[PDB]
């Protein structure tokens, strides 16, 4: 029961995937590593008598 | 004193006399006008409505 001019858009498209290969990497704790100093993972290769 | 006589056919004004003070030489709003007719033009609206 009301009058108005209306404007329309109808889109037509599609995304396809061909190559079945994917490599993704994840990076975490960047802020954590920057804020807190890290220094050396050194391990004491047990020439004290435990080995 | 100058006068202007106004006549009207409406019933509820039957058998009365109403008088007031009027400025005949002015056109703009002013505290010594008895009244001003607030008027803005309006124009005809013609087009088709397919309603109901």
Solving technique: cryo-EM
Q: Contact B34/B20 with Cβ under 8 angstroms?
A: yes
The alpha-carbon gap from B49 to the nearest alpha carbon of chain A, in Å, equals: 8
Residues 6+ apart with CB under 8 A from B20: B34
- Flag if A3 and B52 touch (Cβ within 8 Å): no
Q: Contact B22/B34 with Cβ under 8 angstroms?
A: yes
DSSP state of A34: H
Q: Which residue has the tokens 């109901």?
A: B52
Q: What is the C-alpha to C-alpha distance for residues A31 and A36, in angstroms, rounded to an integer?
A: 9
Chain A residues with CB inside 8 Å of B49's CB? 3
Question: Per DSSP, which regions of A1-51 are E strands?
Answer: none
């Amino acid at each position: 029961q009301r009058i108005g001019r209306e404007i329309r858009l109808t889109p037509r498209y599609r995304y396809f995937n061909f190559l079945p290969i994917m490599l993704v990497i994840n990076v975490i704790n960047l802020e954590e590593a920057i804020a807190q100093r890290t220094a050396l993972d050194v391990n004491e290769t047990q020439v004290t008598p435990a080995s | 004193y100058d006068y202007t006589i106004a006549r009207i056919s409406d019933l509820r004004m039957k058998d009365k006399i109403v008088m007031t003070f009027i400025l005949p030489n002015e056109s703009e709003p002013h505290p010594l006008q008895h009244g001003v007719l607030g008027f803005i033009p309006e124009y005809l609206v013609d087009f088709n409505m397919i309603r109901n």
